[PDB]
Amino acid sequence: KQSVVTLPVYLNFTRADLIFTVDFEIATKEDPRSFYERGVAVLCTE
Amino acid sequence: TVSQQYLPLSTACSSIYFTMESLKQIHFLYQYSLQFFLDIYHNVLYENPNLVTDHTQRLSIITKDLFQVAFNRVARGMLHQDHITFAMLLARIKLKGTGEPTYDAEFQHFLRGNEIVLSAGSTPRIQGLTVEQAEAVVRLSCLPAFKDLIAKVQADEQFGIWLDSSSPEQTVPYLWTPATPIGQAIHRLLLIQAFRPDRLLAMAHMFVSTNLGESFMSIMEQPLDLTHIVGTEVKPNTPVLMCSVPGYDASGHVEDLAAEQNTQITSIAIGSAEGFNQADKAINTAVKSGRWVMLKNVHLAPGWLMQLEKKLHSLQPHACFRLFLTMEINPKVPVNLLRAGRIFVFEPPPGVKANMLRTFSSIPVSRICKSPNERARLYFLLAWFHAIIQERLRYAPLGWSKKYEFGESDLRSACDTVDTWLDDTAKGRQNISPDKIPWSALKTLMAQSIYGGRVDNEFDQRLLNTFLERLFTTRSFDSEFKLACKVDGHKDIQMPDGIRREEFVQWVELLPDTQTPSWLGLPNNAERVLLTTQGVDMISKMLKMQMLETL
């Protein structure tokens, strides 16, 4: 019921079918702006 | 006398024109007539730079000018994926035209070595080379000059950096007698294709630099100079074809040229019967008087295009009259009018440097230079942001989840909003503090209405908001503000310290010719597969070239 990075989960490598969002835990020195700009995501089938 | 003076020039003439003719086996957008090539000759022989009364060097000037202007006038109407192929073919013609050992076996291995058969069951060392690298090395080992490459790779075991990983195009290891620099370039290009195929385009670019000159393809990177080309080197009865990719057009360019040259254009959108009647009346009146006429969205009436080309061929028009035909790149456009007209392809510019150069050329000087003095820096920031988000589209679906259309209209709207909010905040003051700039207004407006209006995904909206918040603060115009991080190891593209538009343009021009997606924020390996498949496409186009020379 109840920094972090919100990673989309796409169905395939075309990244046109968003499925669900995942809130992972960032490391000590990494940056959420870098994670967003670099296009880090989670693929469902590959 | 004439043979010993001008035989190689005529041989290069025939080779260049037949390369231009066989060039249509790539993209069908361009078919070149003999009158185009003879116009190139009447440009070369009668508009001569350094016009030096010594024939021995005058012929060399004529040949160099021929190659350069052939590349210019042909590559202004070619997609950026094929400029390297055309320049490579011109370099092949130049190489064949000179005392240089013609390395036909090496070029044959370069072209159809992928298509040739190789050995089976041969597994070399996997010390630092993968299976495809080993297969490529095995295929290249058949060359007599390159036999002990299997020995040499573990002989130079410390050369795991200049032959694998990093950016190997500059320094390549191993050796092919004192070789001619062009021969060394050929062998090094073969090594690049065998080891690191992702740097094949850069290697071909520097080969063309070594062969035809380092400033051979510099004119492609600069923005198109429509004024001189339209007013000088276009026949009045030749339609000025302006083909363009989807998402980008040239009608604004034609209107801007009309405003600059003080010539009135009747603009007609093709697709209606009244439109056809207007087009015929305007063309007849334009031929009679001289004022320009432009037809828009022309690709929607090929049946009309047939007799349009026939009518244009069967008339003798006024001297200062030009006809512009804007269209999309479609197979329905008749090859008759493609041959008759002059093609200028309009596409998104390649690279952040070229993109910002095009933006700064598009915006007039009086708009940027107006008070207050911070408007120039704001326009520079807007141009950099527009260039970054436009260049991130090429590396889809990593740069953006969808292929949006961040065209010139969005940039014009953003410039208008920046200008209006600056005029609202500054009441005619010569200077304004960077803390008082409506940063929140600009960021919200360009994230929700102008650039973010076309955005579907919440993640794409988050990415655009991240870019806007990162770029549109600058710690309120602080010095040494890092626009990006070009290389993870000690390379940051910091903000120019200038305050004037001329200083910003000088900074833009002084940007290095190298570019990696780390400028954009993407990983440096984002362009690897794209560059590899683009090199394979170049090789396939070259095989298409020399091919003409029960179930």
Swiss-Prot record, chain B:
It comes from the Eukaryota. Residues 204-420 are annotated as: AAA 6. The modification N6-acetyllysine is found at residue 482. It is found in: Cytoplasm, Cytoskeleton. The modification Phosphoserine is found at residue 361. Belongs to the dynein heavy chain family. Homodimer. The cytoplasmic dynein 1 complex consists of two catalytic heavy chains (HCs) and a number of non-catalytic subunits presented by intermediate chains (ICs), light intermediate chains (LICs) and light chains (LCs); the composition seems to vary in respect to the IC, LIC and LC composition. The heavy chain homodimer serves as a scaffold for the probable homodimeric assembly of the respective non-catalytic subunits. The ICs and LICs bind directly to the HC dimer and dynein LCs assemble on the IC dimer. Interacts with DYNC1LI1; DYNC1LI1 and DYNC1LI2 bind mutually exclusive to DYNC1H1. It is linked to Charcot-Marie-Tooth disease, axonal, type 2O: An axonal form of Charcot-Marie-Tooth disease, a disorder of the peripheral nervous system, characterized by progressive weakness and atrophy, initially of the peroneal muscles and later of the distal muscles of the arms. Charcot-Marie-Tooth disease is classified in two main groups on the basis of electrophysiologic properties and histopathology: primary peripheral demyelinating neuropathies (designated CMT1 when they are dominantly inherited) and primary peripheral axonal neuropathies (CMT2). Dynein heavy chains probably consist of an N-terminal stem (which binds cargo and interacts with other dynein components), and the head or motor domain. The motor contains six tandemly-linked AAA domains in the head, which form a ring. A stalk-like structure (formed by two of the coiled coil domains) protrudes between AAA 4 and AAA 5 and terminates in a microtubule-binding site. A seventh domain may also contribute to this ring; it is not clear whether the N-terminus or the C-terminus forms this extra domain. Cytoplasmic dynein 1 acts as a motor for the intracellular retrograde motility of vesicles and organelles along microtubules. Dynein has ATPase activity; the force-producing power stroke is thought to occur on release of ADP. Plays a role in mitotic spindle assembly and metaphase plate congression. This is Cytoplasmic dynein 1 heavy chain 1. The chain holds residues 3796 to 4380 of 4646 of the full protein.
